[PDB]
């Protein structure tokens, strides 16, 4: 249904990498937020919302509009 | 109309020495090409500000140094100055 399940897992692990590499923010809240977001985002079954969310996750990972450190 | 009126509290932003021109702040009474009488401000809040002003007047002939073409203000951005970047 999504662009790629491997792509989803790679995006999630890269977000975890960025959270670990971050300095100012809080690991607990960052990890809880991303985990809750993924849990609420999964199981949608339409796959168009999920490909849009994959695109938005790619944009967030790139961080050309705003980066949280 | 057509009566004498006075405006108080107008400052000088720029002076052109070559053309003998004063750049007074704001608007002044009268039409264009009219004669206006200018003197130091009479307001009590601006009294005793003529310590550095020429006294009794400026004498270019006896002056040791030649004045710049345009005397600006500290806040005035000169036309030749680069584009202003704020902080």
């Amino acid at each position: 249904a999504p662009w790629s399940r491997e792509a989803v897992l790679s995006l999630y692990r890269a977000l975890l990498r960025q959270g670990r590499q971050l300095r100012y923010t809080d690991r607990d809240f960052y990890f809880a937020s991303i985990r809750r977001e993924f849990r609420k985002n999964q199981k949608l079954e339409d796959a168009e919302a999920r490909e849009r969310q994959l695109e938005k996750g790619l944009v967030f990972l790139n961080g050309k509009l705003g980066r949280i450190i | 109309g057509n009566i004498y009126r006075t405006e108080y509290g107008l400052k000088v932003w720029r002076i052109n020495t070559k053309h003998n021109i004063i750049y007074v702040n704001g608007s002044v009474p009268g039409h264009k090409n009219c004669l206006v009488k200018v003197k130091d401000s009479k307001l009590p809040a601006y009294k005793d500000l003529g310590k550095n002003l020429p006294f009794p007047t400026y004498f270019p002939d006896g002056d040791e140094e030649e004045l710049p073409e345009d005397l600006y203000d500290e806040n005035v951005c000169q036309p030749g100055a680069p584009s202003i970047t704020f902080a």
């Binding site: 399940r5 491997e6 897992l9 790679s10 999630y12 692990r13 975890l16 670990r20 985990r35 993924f38 849990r39 999964q42 | -």
Partner: protein
């Protein structure tokens, strides 16, 4: 390096996890049926072990890990 050190460090880091129930934590502990874990949870387990023991674990082989026995074997033969 100690092989039992790798083994018990993996066992300890798996015990450190909270959501999963530490009921049958063996080398052949099947995450999908014994613990009911999904891909996100197993990747979370991969991160939880890598943060304190790793720095050379790629996803291309972590996605098919599925067991602490594989964890120990991969760490031992990579080191």
């Amino acid at each position: 390096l100690t092989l039992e050190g790798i083994q018990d460090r993996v066992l300890y880091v798996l015990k450190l996890y909270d959501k999963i129930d530490p009921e049958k934590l063996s080398v052949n502990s099947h995450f999908m049926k014994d613990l009911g874990l999904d891909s996100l949870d197993q990747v979370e387990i991969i991160m939880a072990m890598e943060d304190e023991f790793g720095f050379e674990i790629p996803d291309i082989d972590a996605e098919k890990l599925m067991c602490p026995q594989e964890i120990v074997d991969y760490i031992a033969d990579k080191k």
